């Protein structure tokens, strides 16, 4: 029952943290400005159904 | 086959108290796509009797 059950908690919480950490850490570290910015990207898809 | 429910009462408030966890939990998780409302969860009852 808990293999899966605690794991993920602990997956998902700690991510949330340290990501929003991470975004203002450098930036306000830095004097910042913009002449770079966030790159996006998308992932191929497989066949899906329909009967 | 008495004891199925032996385990079982024990298991609402064992689980019961797993379900109310993860919910605050995942209420935090997913917080970098933006903002979030809520989900809840309910019990339930019906007609007449006392004892």
Same mark, same amino acid.
């Given at each position: 029952m808990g293999?899966?059950?605690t794991l993920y908690t602990?997956?998902?919480g700690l991510k949330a943290s340290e990501v &929003?950490?991470?975004t203002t850490g450098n930036n306000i570290s830095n004097?910042?400005?913009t002449?770079?910015?966030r790159q996006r990207v998308? &992932?191929?898809?497989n066949g899906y159904i329909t009967t």
């Amino acid at each position: 029952m808990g293999i899966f059950g605690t794991l993920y908690t602990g997956v998902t919480g700690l991510k949330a943290s340290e990501v &929003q950490i991470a975004t203002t850490g450098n930036n306000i570290s830095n004097a910042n400005a913009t002449f770079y910015t966030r790159q996006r990207v998308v &992932q191929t898809t497989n066949g899906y159904i329909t009967t």
